[PDB]
Design an enzyme around this catalytic site. Structure first.
Site, PDB file in Angstrom:
ATOM      1  N   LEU A 190       3.391 -18.306  14.795  1.00  0.00           N
ATOM      2  CA  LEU A 190       3.726 -18.456  16.202  1.00  0.00           C
ATOM      3  C   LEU A 190       4.785 -19.542  16.371  1.00  0.00           C
ATOM      4  CD1 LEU A 190       1.005 -20.297  18.279  1.00  0.00           C
ATOM      5  CD2 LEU A 190       1.142 -20.540  15.826  1.00  0.00           C
ATOM      6  N   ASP A 191       5.633 -19.363  17.377  1.00  0.00           N
ATOM      7  CA  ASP A 191       6.893 -20.087  17.461  1.00  0.00           C
ATOM      8  C   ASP A 191       6.710 -21.493  18.021  1.00  0.00           C
ATOM      9  OD1 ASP A 191       8.408 -18.015  16.395  1.00  0.00           O
ATOM     10  OD2 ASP A 191       8.667 -17.070  18.362  1.00  0.00           O
TER      11      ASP A 191
END
Ligand SMILES: CCCCCCCCCCCCCCCCCC(=O)OC[C@H](COP(=O)([O-])OCC[N+](C)(C)C)OC(=O)CCCCCCCCCCCCCCCCC
Lengths: 94, 87, 65, 459, 165, 73, 119, 176, 128
Positions: free
Chosen positions: B41-42
């Site tokens: 996840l960013d």
């Protein structure tokens, strides 16, 4: 983008020293340190001193404490010598 | 005003509120497992995670320190530096 | 003895603090009712506030033509 | 009075014929016994002043200031160690004996009937003070400070001598009573204007007024604590004392010719309270506080009301005590950290914990604490100047606001908020420092109880 | 006013110390039934504000607006006092709604605790003084003025009208 | 010590403002909010937390009766 | 009220400007009617220590209320109806003042409009 | 303006704008769930052009983003009660006594607390033990003549503590 | 979507809308690099003279000393009396003084005239 390993390691050794310092800071050596009378005084002794103060010295002072007089009525007499006032007159038109 | 704090209790609470947030998996979520490198996840949702820890524990963490959390163990390191969580 | 902090749940209470709270709310509302009914009727005008004084010409007197 | 002079003579060879490590106790004990015998003076009553040994007399313009000098001596004698303990025996004994001779010429000044004797003992007050500040100033512009000091005080006070001699041989003698009981009113030609301007200009130099005031703050901030306290309190209040004496002549012209000094004094009061709002160097703020109070005193003497004179002498005594104490606190902070600047030594609520009580107490006596003697003096000056003119009260109240503001700035900036945590040399406070705090703030509170001792001879 | 806001500040600061130094309106949401002694206290304060009829808070403000409404005033001042009575009603309603009667926003790990004899003594005796003692004062005052007491309609009703609206 | 920590698989959102706002956000076209962090804020001992008039209703539930008692007395 | 609105919006004539109240002469719509009982007995009024701006009409009722309020102090709600009567008498006093203002208003109105119509 | 880097990058700047806007929307929006709605709307606005690499169009959008942030910010931001400007903001800085002191006590009052002062003596011996050689050589060997950063390297070399640790290890508890 | 936020003497322009933090040139980053080098060397010598156990006094900060000697007594050299300096001096010194002189002469002449009338309200005005 984040840590560099020098920062990680230097961080870790400061975590360990902070552990040991703060754990040293909590002392408990099982011996850490080692070396109606109220109502009577506070409603009688200043009361006695102030009523000793309020008769004698302060009444020898001449223009000391002065009362504002109670307010007499036409249906009043006087306690002092005893002399009366004629009462208030007719009421009407109520 | 008496909050008691300890190591493994706050490790439990950080790990718990990471488990409650949905778009991670509860399977491979170790105590020391990364955010960007392995979960994938960013950055933006990572800073939403940092927002969640701030909104839970009652103190802002700065943007100078917000670059470098990246896994829950380092988060517990920085919070234990904040509240001095040792005996 | 004393209470414990719990996590994301509604904390329990002693019955004493809630009976004093309800007791004081009830004494407020009882006071404002017994003060409102038994005596007054206080917020009303307390008197027949009249009209303009009598609405009677030449009673109180107006002697122009 | 001569029984108050002659043991101050005999106290001078005390330090000489006492051996080392024994001089200190001797000088302290004996000057304090002189302070008791000093307070025994107060016999003054009613009709006259008490006049004897024909040169000598005492008003109540002179009794409280004389007791102030003979009580501020041993306080200072104790106060001025830790900065010359490591100096030598000879210069130590010379310092102490120089202070004693300074006291002797001070008391000779305060009990002067004859005004020529007054002027001689006036510049006799001057001459040791220069030697004190210039030899033990412990900074680098002290030399220039002493030079400015002596030339201002002399050249202002020099033609005063010529005017007094002119008085001496145009009227007769200069007994203060025969200056009184005989004074003819002098008219408003130009020579009378110059004579009044000569005497008033000499003491305007001494107070200072606003236009001649940079005399003082260099001489305060570049001096030892003994010279600084004697300088501030005793010298400026001596200038005020001398003006209160010499104003009895030249009455019917000073109304006409004493306007512009009021304007200079009030605008200088506001500018002085504003310049001590923003400086560094903590030592300087108390000097500018002194200039503010003395400008207010000068307003009080140029008006001629008994309210004004009572407020004047009370303001003199109270600010002498207050500014002397706050100088001593400044010296204690500077001996804690060898800085002389301000913002370096922050903190100091935590460490030196009950030092905060004495900063609080001294700064509130500077604030005009609501029963304090400072407030009594400033209040009666404001009352009398309002009777002088109904518009002056803006400058007085604006002075009050800015005075409270710089007092509070001094309180909450030097001694509030955060230790700078790179310091690690400040000790706990010694017993001597707290002893000096006590020796300053017992007489101010005792005078706050019964103050009718120290108000002016216009009682 | 003295009894009134002493009781109000003491209750609110009790809530502040109970909930971790935050003191702000946000993140302070749900507090009714979190023990309701202090919530009772706070709403008794906020109903004694604007003078609910006729309580300790009634007497002062309502006799003020009556005697001010019936006098040779300035024709902007009475209008200002009227509009500010409406405004003090609306922010007291806001402090009620956001502090006590909202859906709960406040951070977790909650240590809501009021098992204190001291604070229940203090809040207890000040609501005692805030329900009866205004009438104990206002009843037997020595009457040192002349009351107006003859108002038209919509000038004694204007107090309750403005507070209700 | 410990905290004993009421855990997950329990919140399970269902609370009607969060459910309807996920409906509205789904109609917008994201369908991915934060989520279930606040079911403790919207269910439990909360949730029919009273509306505004109720804390002022809280008098007469034990006060009207005592008023009628003092009237009949 | 509406008289205030007329006095500021319409003419300034027909509303008499306040605190200069007697402009029409007395005993003019009275004729031969004044008693003004005033049975407060001014000597006993001043021997009582009532305040200025209280030495007013109906003050005997106030004297009655002060008598009962002195004589029955720890009785908390005994003295009601005497002060109620004083309220009622001062209500009638306010009514009399209103009667004075509207008498002056209608005199100014009807008089000055009859005069400035036929002149 | 930050310790390690000489300057902040543009991704960092976009991220700080994100955190500021999100914080002020917290402060703007009560009831917390309509907050959650508006926050995902804001995150959608950043999803609208997230996948573009025209750096000059990116900084154009960043300038317009700063404008649209300043247009609708909140007057009093909800700041936490330990933040700068907060309700406490070092409340107990009163009670934070430094630890270079506490040794200017009296030996009677020192003898009232035996074990803490014995362990403090061995702490101070730990300080003076490895102050000179290892710390000073690692600071006068491994840095350049111009240091050009401020993060100091740990004592990975052989033995004792990483350099210059006294006033950083020995800071107080922040709640005494 | 904004009126673009003019600054003032007080309303400081925050670091967002500079817009000088956008057209970054070479010497800008060179200046930030050398500025970090300066802050790095100063904190290095500070932390060296800050963690010494042999250290007794203060850390003896030279820049505060330098600024003190600047603000205190290095005002006067240098100084030449120019047009600006002299004009602002004669304004700020003599101006308000002569203003207060005129207002005090005004009030004193009014008071002397009113008491020379004979009708001053000295009904009792004792404490003069
Ligand atoms: C400041 C200068 C002050 C000079 C001394 C004051 C003085 O005596 O001035 C008058 C003196 C001279 O005035 P005088 O004192 O000689 O007064 C005139 C008196 N008869 C006419 C009898 C001679 O002037 C100066 O001192 C010169 C300036």
């Amino acid at each position: 983008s984040g840590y560099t390993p020098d920062e990680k390691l230097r961080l870790q050794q400061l975590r360990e020293l902070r552990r040991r310092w703060l754990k040293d800071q909590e002392l408990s050596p099982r011996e850490p340190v080692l070396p109606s009378i109220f109502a009577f005084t506070h409603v009688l002794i200043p009361v006695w001193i102030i009523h000793y103060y309020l008769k004698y010295h302060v009444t020898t002072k001449p223009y000391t404490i002065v009362e504002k007089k109670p307010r007499i009525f036409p249906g009043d007499t006087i306690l002092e010598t005893g002399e009366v006032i004629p009462p208030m007159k007719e009421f009407p038109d109520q | 005003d008496a909050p008691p704090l300890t190591l493994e209790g706050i490790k439990d609470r950080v790990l718990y509120v990471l488990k409650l947030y949905d778009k991670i998996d509860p399977e491979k979520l170790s105590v020391n497992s990364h955010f960007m490198k392995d979960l994938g996840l960013d950055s933006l949702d990572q800073v939403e995670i940092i927002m969640a820890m701030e909104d839970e524990f009652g103190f802002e963490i700065p943007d100078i320190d917000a670059e470098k959390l990246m896994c829950p163990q380092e988060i517990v390191d920085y919070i234990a530096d904040k509240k001095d969580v040792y005996e | 003895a004393h209470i414990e902090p719990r996590y994301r749940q509604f904390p329990q209470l002693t019955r004493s603090q809630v009976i004093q709270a309800e007791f004081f709310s009830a004494t407020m509302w009882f006071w404002i009712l017994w003060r409102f009914w038994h005596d007054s009727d206080a917020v009303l005008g307390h008197f027949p506030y009249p009209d303009p004084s009598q609405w009677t010409d030449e009673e109180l007197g107006i002697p122009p033509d | 009075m001569l029984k108050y002079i002659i043991p101050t003579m005999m106290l001078m060879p005390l330090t000489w014929l006492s051996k080392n490590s024994m001089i200190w106790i001797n000088t302290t004990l004996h000057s304090l016994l002189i302070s008791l015998t000093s307070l025994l003076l107060l016999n003054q009553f009613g009709d006259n002043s008490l006049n004897f040994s024909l040169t000598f007399f005492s008003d109540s313009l002179s009794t409280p200031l004389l007791i102030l000098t003979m009580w501020l001596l041993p306080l200072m004698l104790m106060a001025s160690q830790h900065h010359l303990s490591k100096e030598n025996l000879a210069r130590k004994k010379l310092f102490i004996s120089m202070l004693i001779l300074l006291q002797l010429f001070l008391i000779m000044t305060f009990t002067a009937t004859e005004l020529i004797f007054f002027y001689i003992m006036f510049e006799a007050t001057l001459v040791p003070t220069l030697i004190i500040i210039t030899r033990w100033g412990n900074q680098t512009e002290r030399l220039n400070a002493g030079l400015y000091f002596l030339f201002y005080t002399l050249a202002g006070s020099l033609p005063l001598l010529v005017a007094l001699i002119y008085i001496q041989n145009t009227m007769g003698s200069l007994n203060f009573l025969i200056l009184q009981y005989w004074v003819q009113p002098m008219p408003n030609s130009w020579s009378n204007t110059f004579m009044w301007l000569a005497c008033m200009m000499a003491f305007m130099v001494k107070m200072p007024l606003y236009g001649l005031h940079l005399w003082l703050p260099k001489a305060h901030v570049e001096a030892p604590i003994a010279g600084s306290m004697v300088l501030a309190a005793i010298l400026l209040k001596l200038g005020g004392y001398g003006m209160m004496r010499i104003t009895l002549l030249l009455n019917p012209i000073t109304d006409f010719m004493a306007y512009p000094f009021i304007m200079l004094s009030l605008w200088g009061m506001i500018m002085t309270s504003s310049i001590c709002l923003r400086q560094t160097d903590l030592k300087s703020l108390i000097a500018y506080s002194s200039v503010s109070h003395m400008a207010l005193v000068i307003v009080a003497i140029l008006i001629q009301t008994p309210w004004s004179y009572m407020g004047a002498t009370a303001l003199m005594i109270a600010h002498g005590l207050t500014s002397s104490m706050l100088f001593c606190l400044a010296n204690s902070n500077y001996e804690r950290v060898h800085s002389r600047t301000m913002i370096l030594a922050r903190g100091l609520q935590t460490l030196l914990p009950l030092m905060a009580a004495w900063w609080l107490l001294a700064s509130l006596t500077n604030l005009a604490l609501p029963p304090s003697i400072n407030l009594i003096g400033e209040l009666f000056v404001v009352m009398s100047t309002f009777s002088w003119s109904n518009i002056t009260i803006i400058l007085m109240g604006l002075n009050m606001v800015i005075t409270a503001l710089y007092s509070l700035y001094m309180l909450i900036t030097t001694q509030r908020g955060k230790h700078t945590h790179h310091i690690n040399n400040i000790l706990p406070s010694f017993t001597r420092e707290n002893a000096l705090m006590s020796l300053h703030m017992l007489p101010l509170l005792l005078l706050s109880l019964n103050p009718k001792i120290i108000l002016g001879p216009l009682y | 006013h003295a009894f009134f806001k002493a009781m109000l500040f003491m209750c609110s600061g009790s809530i502040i110390h109970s909930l971790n130094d935050e003191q702000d309106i946000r993140k302070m949401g749900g507090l009714f039934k979190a023990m309701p002694f202090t919530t009772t206290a706070l709403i008794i304060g906020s109903l004694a504000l604007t003078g609910m009829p006729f309580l300790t808070g009634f007497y002062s403000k309502d006799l003020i607006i009556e005697s001010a409404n019936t006098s040779y005033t300035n024709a902007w001042a009475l209008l200002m006092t009227l509009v500010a009575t409406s405004f003090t009603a609306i922010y007291s309603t806001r402090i009620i709604f956001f502090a006590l009667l909202g859906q709960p926003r406040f951070p977790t790990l909650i240590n809501i605790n009021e098992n204190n004899p001291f604070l229940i003594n203090s809040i207890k005796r000040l609501l005692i003084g805030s329900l009866f003692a205004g009438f104990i004062i206002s009843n037997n005052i020595p009457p040192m003025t002349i009351p107006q007491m003859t108002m038209p309609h919509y000038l004694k009703m204007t107090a309750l009208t403005v507070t209700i609206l | 010590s410990k905290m004993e920590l009421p855990d997950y698989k329990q919140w399970k959102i269902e609370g009607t403002p969060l459910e309807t706002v996920q409906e509205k956000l789904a109609a917008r076209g994201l369908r991915d909010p934060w989520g279930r962090n606040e079911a403790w804020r919207y269910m439990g001992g909360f949730a029919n937390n009273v509306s505004f008039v109720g804390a002022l209703l809280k008098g007469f539930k034990w006060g009207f009766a005592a008023f009628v008692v003092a009237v009949g007395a | 009220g509406a008289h205030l609105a007329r006095r500021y919006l319409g003419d300034a004539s027909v509303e008499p400007e306040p605190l200069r109240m007697p402009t029409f002469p007395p005993d003019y719509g009275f004729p031969e009617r004044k008693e003004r009982e005033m049975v407060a007995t001014q000597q006993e009024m001043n021997d009582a220590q009532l305040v200025l701006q209280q030495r007013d009409y109906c003050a005997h009722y106030l004297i009655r209320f002060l008598k009962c309020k002195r004589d029955s102090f720890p009785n908390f709600l005994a003295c009601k109806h005497e002060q109620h009567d004083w309220d009622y008498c001062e209500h009638l006093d306010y009514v009399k003042r209103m009667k004075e203002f509207e008498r002056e208003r209608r005199l100014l109105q009807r008089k000055k409009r009859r005069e400035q119509r036929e002149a | 303006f930050l310790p390690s880097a000489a300057y902040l990058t543009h991704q960092q700047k976009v991220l700080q704008l994100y955190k500021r806007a999100l914080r002020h929307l917290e402060s703007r929006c009560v009831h917390r769930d309509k907050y959650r709605y508006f926050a995902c709307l804001l995150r959608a606005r950043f999803d609208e052009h997230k996948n573009e690499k025209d750096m000059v169009k990116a900084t154009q959008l960043l300038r317009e983003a700063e404008k649209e942030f300043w247009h609708g910010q909140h007057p009093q931001p909800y700041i936490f009660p330990e933040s700068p400007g907060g309700t406490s903001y070092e409340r107990y800085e009163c009670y934070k006594v430094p630890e270079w002191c506490l040794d200017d006590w009296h030996p009677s009052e020192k003898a009232m607390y035996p074990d803490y002062f014995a362990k403090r003596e061995q702490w101070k011996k730990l300080r003076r033990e490895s102050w000179e050689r290892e710390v000073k050589q690692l600071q006068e060997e491994t840095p350049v003549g111009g240091p050009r950063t401020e993060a100091l390297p740990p004592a990975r070399k052989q033995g004792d503590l990483p350099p210059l640790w006294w006033h950083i290890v020995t800071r107080p508890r922040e709640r005494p | 979507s904004f009126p673009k936020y003019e600054p003032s003497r007080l309303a400081s322009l925050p670091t967002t809308l500079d817009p000088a933090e956008y057209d970054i040139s070479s010497e800008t980053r060179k200046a930030q690099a050398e500025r970090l080098a300066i802050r790095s060397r100063l904190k290095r010598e500070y932390q060296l003279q800050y963690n010494d156990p042999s250290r007794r006094g203060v850390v003896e900060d030279p820049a505060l000393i330098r600024w003190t000697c600047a603000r205190s007594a290095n005002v006067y050299p240098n100084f030449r009396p120019n047009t600006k300096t002299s004009l602002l001096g004669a304004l700020f010194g003599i101006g308000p003084l002569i203003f207060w002189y005129y207002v005090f002469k005004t009030d004193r002449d009014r008071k002397e005239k009113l008491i020379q009338e004979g009708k001053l309200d000295r009904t009792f005005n004792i404490s003069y």
